[PDB]
């Protein structure tokens, strides 16, 4: 038999996932970055203005 070995042959299958491709869809959501300081500033002002 073929006795060949490598770090691959002895190793483990990769833990691969798929990114958001942004392809083969009709629409792509607007990328809307919002940090926790912004959510607090929005929510606090909304509470103060009520």
């Amino acid at each position: 038999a073929n006795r060949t070995v490598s770090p691959s042959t002895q190793g483990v299958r990769p833990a691969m996932r798929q990114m958001y491709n942004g392809r083969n869809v009709a629409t792509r959501p607007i990328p809307l970055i919002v940090d926790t300081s912004e959510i607090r500033a929005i929510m606090a002002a909304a509470a103060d203005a009520r």
Binding site: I30, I42, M43, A46
Partner: protein, 50 residues
């Protein structure tokens, strides 16, 4: 972007009207409507003549 766009000939040519609703600030309809304090003064009314 985030605008829902409505075609409306009751907006005159050469004007844009942008309106917000909901959210953390809880926006509502922009114009307050006042009726007369007398109950008999309310609605369209037909009146006997002289």
């Amino acid at each position: 972007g985030f605008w829902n766009i409505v075609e409306e000939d009751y907006i005159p040519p050469g004007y844009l009207v942008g309106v917000g609703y909901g959210g953390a600030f809880n926006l509502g309809n922009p114009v307050g409507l006042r009726q007369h304090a007398n109950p008999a003064m309310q609605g369209l009314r037909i009146i006997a003549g002289n």
